[PDB]
């Protein structure tokens, strides 16, 4: 469940909680991928 | 050594079942238990069926060697060449075996004690003889014992 | 005192000398074939952990509680604080491992004695030793309890001085 | 749900507009790991084996072998709930303020959700990356006023049992003096087995233009980074600048195993469910953030602090 | 057997989550050769050729030709077995001990056999690492106690017929010194016609310290590897850092023709079919491992000792 | 025969510690392939 | 007979029996012990009461 998914559509607030949290780990996930040091 | 590795010319008769294990080579003892403790320790000189003491002291683990008295610390029942290893039974644990006797005058029903070369030897006291020494070859004398101990 | 011994703010800080703790592994060489006894013993007399303890039948049960060479029924390997129960090495076992004394200057061979406390001494004391104790290694200082790697096997013929 | 809550709806629209946290780039991707809580505390157990003796021979038999014994140990870490409030204007009422390519009362410095949001969240996460880095929340430059946090709850500036080193406010401007200070910390680091890792120095601006400097044709900066490849098994030793600090060096490994970073899932901004309404057209809305989750080993951190008086 | 052996089945699934050991960092991949023996000794045969005289001109007729000679060189390794035992709970036993987030009993220090299996490896591997580098086995910090090994049975750092230097006490601190014995011990290195290979360099961390002082905007590591690039054709130079050795420097070609690493395929930790059981929740389980197996020519390992007393 | 085959079922004991050396083996074989000196 | 060994089924079936009485005088009494005289008294845990005491 992830903002980032177009099909995803969250039922409930709880639900939109947890698509913002993986949204936001994904996000973190894909920085250090392009982070060049 | 324990089996001293000669290539003969002949096969050896062997097929009498009788006075066949009173032998230098026959490790282990006559009866052992499942429960018996065993345990391995670095060892100098040659203390095979002998009784060993523990020697501590670049810096090593301490090691064995053939001894008793106050310093007994158990029996060598059997030898590794190639590890320089010997399999120790603790004082602690009783053991029934053939062992080395200082000489001839050993007889049944003698209490003995293990001397300064971890030999057995007529009167504390540690193992009582269970048969006359009987000589291997040469000045080595086998002695059948039954450890119990130290008095 | 206890073994386990409390929430940290951070961790602790080669393999090499890891096996100094105070509630490390006893034994450390161990066996199969090894007896191990239960008992019950005092909670508020004496701390029996990695101690010589005695027998001592009480009116309700047999407990054990730290004792001299002299009366000494075995070692006391580990402890269950829940059940305050200890487990007994008996003394016709052999043991080699990490033992609780009191002197914290202690060379390696050297001959040892249990105290009226169940704590390993240097047996030039004085009282007749009456079990072969010797030191594998010197005498080391957790920060405090001073601890020694000894073997024990068996007792001693006659009683040395 | 997007067809009722149209706030809802305009945050998960907007949600990607919002830039990176910076304190990513003070942690390798492995270090960072997300927990499941809001508020409270947790127990971590760190579990260790250690020898009891040498090997045993395996020759002819034995029963006697050499053991191998465990250890464990616990860190209690804390974890704080803060919230927010903002004020913005209600869905129905942005047809009658939507002027030339632009929505919102100059005057009145009213402004639409979405807007709201976004910049909000942009100045929670700097003070979220604040704290990371100094342990402190404060929202003066003098660093005063700070609010009372629980213990367990430390940045990477006052982790406590770390190497804290001064530089007297005499030598205050002496390079040399500071790196003496430097190499003196350096020595007293403990890496133990894990110290074959990537390295992470941050300063602060001052610090920075003494860098520079030439050392007393090489540069204080050059000879910095040879003396911590000295001790990392000469591998990557990374330089960064904040304005976040005040005359501090930080130096650190890049190791999981040594420093590792235990966030809540729920660490960085979230929107709450509830909303002000009234006869106005004026609302209101609430953020959520939590705090901690850093957790390091002892002696692994060099706080190096330059005293001005 | 999966279906039997539930032990054997735990240790399939975690034993990917093992860390290689770092010794193959001082090999290169064709220095490595697995043998299958657990214990005991093998010989190995190395043959050469050699020419007898000049080439035999063909021209008209002739019979009598220049003839190639052969050669042939018995070596003997040691392998010897050692074995380690650790206790863990009991499979059945588990899930009485399962608790949030962990499993095991924080107050008895027992673990499930997953994790403590993977917790004993580690050590295991630590003692191998240290003992092929070095040549001894200890758990001291003193390096006492020493567990006596068998002949044939050598390390990088206790290899016999190597160039062996030493440094006086008086010396201990003063790098031209020292940098002069390594002078001397590369002079006396013969590698003969395989000199063309790359070299690496293993120091401790308070020589690592002392490399990266200014050449006395040079360095002493930048002569150093200058030094050893003179001998060796110019090729790659390694340097390592290791908190095993202690005023110690090793200097050995990266040449499987020179130096040769034949370690048993059993060398890392192994489980062992027997398991104690009783009545009680707590079972035994040992690990096997092999040591021994390095190989090298004559007059190919400087070994520099910087004594301290 | 190794463990990384998800179509490996070991039979008995000896052809899981084969497997474990084999294991062993492929894992020094990769990590020399991803060094980069 | 002459040694007091019987088939594991039986010896079972006993062994269980002389059990679920012992449990019972505990949940009853609230002491463990095997003596008529009632001394000798295992020690149990704290908050571990039968309804007599």
Same mark, same amino acid.
């Given at each position: 469940?992830?903002?980032?998914?177009?099909?995803?559509?969250?039922?409930?607030?709880?639900?939109?909680?947890?698509?913002?949290?993986?949204?936001?780990?994904?996000?973190?996930?894909?920085?250090?991928?392009?982070?060049?040091? | 050594?324990?089996?001293?590795?000669? #290539?003969?010319?002949?096969?050896?008769?062997?097929? /009498? %079942?009788?006075?066949?294990? @009173?032998?230098?080579?026959?490790?282990?003892?006559?009866?052992?238990?499942?429960? #018996?403790?065993?345990?391995?320790?670095?060892?100098?000189?040659?203390?095979?069926?002998?009784? @060993?003491?523990?020697?501590?002291?670049?810096?090593?683990?301490?090691?064995?060697?053939?001894?008793?008295? /106050?310093?007994l610390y158990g029996i060598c029942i059997d030898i590794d060449e190639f590890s320089k290893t010997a399999t120790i039974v603790p004082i602690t644990n009783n %053991? /029934?075996?053939?062992?080395?006797?200082? #000489?001839?005058? @050993?007889?049944?029903?003698?209490?003995?004690?293990?001397?300064? #070369?971890?030999?057995?030897?007529? @009167?504390?006291?540690?193992?009582?003889?269970?048969?006359?020494?009987?000589?291997?070859?040469?000045?080595?004398?086998?002695?059948?014992?039954?450890?119990?101990?130290?008095? | 005192?206890?073994?386990?011994?409390?929430?940290?703010?951070?961790?602790?800080?080669?393999?090499?000398?890891?096996?100094?703790?105070?509630?490390?592994?006893?034994?450390?060489?161990?066996?199969?074939?090894?007896?191990?006894?239960?008992?019950?013993?005092?909670?508020?007399?004496?701390?029996?952990?990695?101690?010589? !303890?005695?027998?001592?039948?009480?009116?309700?049960?047999?407990?054990?509680?730290?004792?001299?060479?002299?009366?000494?029924?075995?070692?006391?390997?580990?402890?269950?604080?829940?059940?305050?129960?200890?487990?007994?090495?008996?003394?016709?076992?052999?043991?080699?491992?990490?033992? !609780?004394?009191?002197?914290?200057?202690?060379?390696?061979?050297?001959?040892?004695?249990?105290?009226?406390?169940?704590?390993?001494?240097?047996?030039?004391?004085?009282?007749?030793?009456?079990?072969?104790?010797?030191?594998?290694?010197?005498?080391?200082?957790?920060?405090?309890?001073?601890?020694?790697?000894?073997?024990?096997?068996?007792?001693?013929?006659?009683?040395?001085? | 749900?997007?067809?009722?809550?149209?706030?809802?709806?305009?945050?998960?629209? =907007?949600?990607?507009?919002?830039?990176?946290?910076?304190?990513?780039?003070?942690?390798?991707?492995?270090?960072?790991?997300?927990?499941?809580?809001?508020?409270?505390? *947790?127990?971590?157990?760190?579990?260790?084996?250690?020898?009891?003796?040498?090997?045993?021979?395996?020759?002819?038999?034995?029963?006697?072998?050499?053991?191998?014994?465990?250890?464990?140990?616990?860190?209690?870490?804390?974890?704080?709930?803060?919230?927010?409030?903002?004020?913005?204007?209600?869905?129905?009422?942005?047809?009658?303020?939507?002027?030339?390519?632009?929505?919102?009362?100059?005057?009145?410095?009213?402004?639409?959700?979405?807007?709201?949001?976004?910049?909000?969240?942009?100045? =929670? =996460?700097?003070?979220?990356?604040?704290?990371?880095?100094?342990?402190?929340?404060?929202?003066?430059?003098?660093?005063?006023? *700070?609010?009372?946090?629980?213990?367990?709850?430390?940045?990477?500036?006052?982790?406590?049992?770390?190497?804290?080193?001064?530089?007297? &406010?005499?030598?205050?401007?002496?390079?040399?003096?500071?790196?003496?200070?430097?190499?003196?910390?350096?020595?007293?680091?403990?890496?133990g087995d894990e110290f074959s890792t990537p390295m992470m120095v941050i300063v602060d601006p001052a610090t920075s233009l003494k860098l520079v400097k030439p050392?007393?044709?090489?540069?204080?900066?050059?000879?910095?980074? *040879?003396?911590?490849?000295?001790?990392?098994?000469?591998?990557?030793?990374? =330089?960064?600048? &904040?304005?976040?600090?005040?005359?501090?060096?930080?130096?650190?490994?890049?190791?999981?195993?040594?420093?590792?970073?235990?966030?809540?899932?729920?660490?960085?901004?979230?929107?709450?469910?509830?909303?002000?309404?009234?006869?106005?057209?004026?609302?209101?809305?609430?953020?959520?953030?939590?705090?901690?989750?850093?957790?390091?080993?002892?002696?692994?951190?060099? *706080?190096?602090?330059?005293?001005?008086?």
């Open positions: 469940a992830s903002l980032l998914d177009s099909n995803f559509v969250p039922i409930n607030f709880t639900e939109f909680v947890q698509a913002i949290s993986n949204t936001y780990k994904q996000r973190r996930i894909q920085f250090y991928e392009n982070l060049k040091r | 050594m324990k089996n001293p590795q000669h #290539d003969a010319s002949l096969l050896s008769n062997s097929n /009498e %079942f009788r006075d066949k294990n @009173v032998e230098f080579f026959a490790s282990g003892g006559t009866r052992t238990s499942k429960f #018996d403790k065993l345990e391995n320790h670095p060892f100098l000189g040659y203390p095979y069926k002998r009784g @060993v003491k523990r020697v501590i002291q670049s810096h090593y683990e301490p090691h064995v060697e053939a001894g008793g008295g /106050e310093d %053991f /029934e075996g053939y062992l080395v006797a200082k #000489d001839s005058t @050993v007889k049944v029903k003698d209490k003995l004690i293990f001397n300064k #070369d971890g030999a057995l030897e007529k @009167v504390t006291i540690n193992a009582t003889a269970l048969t006359d020494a009987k000589q291997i070859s040469n000045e080595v004398y086998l002695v059948k014992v039954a450890v119990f101990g130290n008095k | 005192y206890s073994k386990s011994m409390i929430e940290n703010k951070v961790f602790s800080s080669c393999f090499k000398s890891k096996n100094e703790r105070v509630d490390a592994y006893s034994f450390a060489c161990s066996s199969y074939t090894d007896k191990i006894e239960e008992y019950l013993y005092d909670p508020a007399n004496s701390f029996p952990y990695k101690r010589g !303890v005695k027998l001592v039948p009480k009116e309700n049960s047999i407990y054990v509680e730290v004792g001299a060479d002299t009366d000494m029924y075995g070692i006391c390997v580990d402890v269950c604080e829940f059940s305050c129960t200890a487990y007994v090495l008996p003394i016709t076992n052999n043991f080699e491992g990490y033992l !609780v004394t009191r002197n914290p200057s202690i060379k390696i061979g050297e001959i040892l004695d249990i105290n009226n406390n169940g704590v390993i001494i240097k047996a030039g004391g004085g009282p007749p030793t009456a079990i072969n104790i010797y030191a594998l290694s010197d005498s080391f200082t957790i920060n405090s309890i001073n601890l020694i790697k000894v073997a024990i096997f068996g007792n001693r013929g006659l009683e040395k001085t | 749900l997007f067809d009722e809550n149209y706030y809802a709806k305009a945050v998960a629209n =907007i949600i990607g507009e919002v830039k990176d946290p910076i304190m990513y780039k003070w942690f390798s991707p492995d270090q960072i790991e997300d927990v499941d809580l809001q508020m409270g505390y *947790q127990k971590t157990v760190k579990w260790d084996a250690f020898l009891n003796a040498n090997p045993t021979t395996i020759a002819n038999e034995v029963n006697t072998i050499s053991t191998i014994g465990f250890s464990s140990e616990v860190v209690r870490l804390n974890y704080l709930k803060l919230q927010y409030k903002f004020r913005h204007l209600k869905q129905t009422s942005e047809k009658f303020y939507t002027s030339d390519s632009y929505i919102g009362d100059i005057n009145n410095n009213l402004l639409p959700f979405a807007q709201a949001y976004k910049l909000a969240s942009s100045e =929670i =996460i700097k003070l979220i990356n604040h704290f990371v880095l100094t342990g402190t929340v404060s929202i003066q430059k003098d660093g005063k006023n *700070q609010k009372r946090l629980l213990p367990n709850m430390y940045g990477l500036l006052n982790m406590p049992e770390q190497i804290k080193e001064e530089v007297a &406010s005499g030598d205050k401007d002496k390079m040399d003096k500071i790196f003496e200070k430097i190499e003196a910390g350096l020595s007293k680091l403990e890496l050392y007393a044709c090489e540069k204080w900066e050059d000879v910095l980074i *040879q003396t911590i490849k000295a001790i990392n098994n000469r591998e990557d030793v990374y =330089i960064e600048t &904040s304005n976040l600090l005040k005359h501090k060096i930080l130096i650190y490994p890049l190791n999981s195993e040594l420093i590792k970073f235990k966030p809540s899932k729920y660490m960085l901004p979230t929107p709450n469910e509830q909303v002000d309404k009234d006869s106005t057209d004026v609302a209101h809305s609430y953020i959520d953030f939590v705090l901690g989750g850093l957790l390091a080993t002892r002696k692994t951190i060099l *706080q190096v602090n330059i005293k001005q008086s």
